[PDB]
Amino acid sequence: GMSQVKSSYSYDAPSDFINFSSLNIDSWFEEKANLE
C-alpha cells in the first residue's frame, strides 16, 4: 500500500555558516530550468 518515505533533509539550499557583518545567485532558477 501507500507509505511516506523518510527524507534526509539534504536540500539544494545554503547550510553554510555566514559572517553577518558584512557582505547573482537567483540564476539558480534559470539554471535549474535549463536542465535537459
Binding site: Q4, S7, Y9, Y11, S15, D16, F17, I18, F20, F29
Partner: protein
Amino acid sequence: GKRQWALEDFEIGRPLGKGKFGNVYLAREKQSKFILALKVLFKAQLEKAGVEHQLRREVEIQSHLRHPNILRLYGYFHDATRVYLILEYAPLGTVYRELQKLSKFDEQRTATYITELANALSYCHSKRVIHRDIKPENLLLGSAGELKIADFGWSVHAPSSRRTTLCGTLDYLPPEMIEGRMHDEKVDLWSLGVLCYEFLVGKPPFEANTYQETYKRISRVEFTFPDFVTEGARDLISRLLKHNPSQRPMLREVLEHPWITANSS
C-alpha cells in the same frame, strides 16, 4: 566543505510567533551579534502531516530569492528531531496584526502595500516562481514599515507547464483551483485582489459561514463593494478578480494602475 550552521551559533529569546510544527524565535548569531528569526520545525510533525515536500520547496525557493520585499532565508540546518530556518527579522510584525488593530486600511496604506507586494511578486514571476499563498498572515513588516512576503511552503518553481496542486487558503483561493483546473502564475493576481479588498474593507469578499458557501461564491465571482470603496479601488479589484485567469492584468498593469499611482507613496 565549509563551516556549517549549528544550534550553538544562536542566542535565543522571545518567541515571535507560534505555528503548527513549531515556533519562530527572536535569535542572535553570537559572532556578529546579528538579529534573526529562527524558525523551528519538528520532523515528526512535518512527516505526520505529510508536508516535508512543501518544506523542501520553501527552503529551496525562498533561499534563492533576493528582494527587499521578500523576507530572506539566509540558510537552514537540522538535527535528529528538528529543522531550523534562519530567516530575516521583521521588527513590525505581520500585516495581519496591523489590519486587526486598524480594522481596515486607508487607500494610501493599501496601494503602497499592493505596490511592494506586486514588486515582490513581479520578481518571483520573473524567476518563474508562483507563491500561491498570498494572505495577510503571510505578510510581514520591516524597519521602515515595508511589506515582506514570506511563508513560501505552497510556492513552486513552474518554468514550463501549469500546475495541479489544490493549495492556498480558504478566502484567497482562485476559482480555477476550486473548479479543479490546472493553474498558472495568474493565481497570485487573483489573491492580490482579494488582499486589496480585505485591506480596504476589513474582511474578504467571499467570506461565509461555511467553506462550501465560500467555494460557490468564488466560483461565481459573487461579491459586492461597500459604499466607501472608491471608483479607482473598485476598478482594480474587479480587474484582478476575473474568473478567467487570462483576463487578470499583468503585475506591470497593477503597478501602473491610476489608483495605485495616485495613492502609492
